[PDB]
């Protein structure tokens with residue numbers, strides 16, 4: 242009850258910044274996450290014994306893949322923490338509880354393959370969930386872990402509060418389907434420009450939490466250049482393995498996934514920064530002004546990729 246988590250000085254300060262890197266010491270990631278829940282939500286919102294057991298079960302259900310691993314889960318949760326901390330008064334007690342858990346759980350049991358590859362492979366998950374395949378599975382894995390003995394971190398919520406938090410978590414995890422991001426951002430852009438955006442409209446909140454989820458999920462593009470550049474290696478390690486599996490099924494992969502077209506990576510990052518990242522953090526900064534450091538860091542990284550192309554690195 243009086244058991245406060247404390248970080249070493251440099252972490253205590255740097256963890257409040259959007260561009261914080263959680264570091265290569267795995268055994269500290271759980272304490273980093275509790276620290277973020279305690280400061281974001283209160284030291285009262287979860288039973289520590291249940292939270293710790295929830296976190297360790299969630300960790301055990303991430304796989305040893307190069308990118309969509311336990312470190313991605315905690316990085317994405319840290320990005321959400323930064324947003325919530327910079328937008329204190331805009332979010333309810335339940336949204337703060339739900340969204341950090343959503344971020345930790347958002348890629349549970351990811352095998353390092355896209356929804357596309359599952360569909361072309363004819364994976365059982367593709368038959369069970371026709372759209373947002375992996376994301377309905379991640380949500381499904383989250384409920385499973387929540388139903389383990391001694392793992393219900395929401396035990397002291399009412400029936401209605403419990404259904405609300407699981408609904409926040411479900412929508413939050415589905416929104417990490419980047420196929421859904423494009424229309425969600427276009428609608429938020431229109432609603433912001435015409436002035437119809439209303440944070441008391443529940444369907445409007447849903448959309449704003451969706452864009453935050455996309456923003457946190459993509460947050461490798463908002464780190465310092467060395468973190469961004471080295472995360473891109475892990476991202477492409479998975480992409481190229483998927484490309485290999487596409488060729489094994491008799492299908493030429495898109496160039497993004499073809500390790501033969503490794504040369505085209507820098508131009509591919511430009512496309513992604515221009516088509517996805519910059520629009521995402523632009524719309525997010527318009528709706529939530531204090532998230533502007535994500536946009537600025539993203540722009541800096543775009544400029545760094547332009548320098549790679551111009552043979553300056």
Ligand SMILES: Cn1ncc(C(=O)N2CCC2)c1C(=O)Nc1cccc(-c2nc3ccccc3o2)c1
Pocket residue numbers: 419459461462473476496497498502503504505506507508509510512513
């Ligand atoms: C940095 N980052 N962070 C998350 C993701 C992402 O999309 N994820 C889905 C699971 C994480 C990415 C990312 O880089 N996406 C991306 C998007 C569109 C195109 C390209 C691209 N690269 C190419 C290289 C050579 C030729 C053509 C190429 O096209 C790359």
Ligand SMILES: [Mg+2]
Pocket residue numbers: 347348375417
């Ligand atoms: Mg995902």
Ligand SMILES: [Zn+2]
Pocket residue numbers: 313317347348417458
């Ligand atoms: Zn993710």
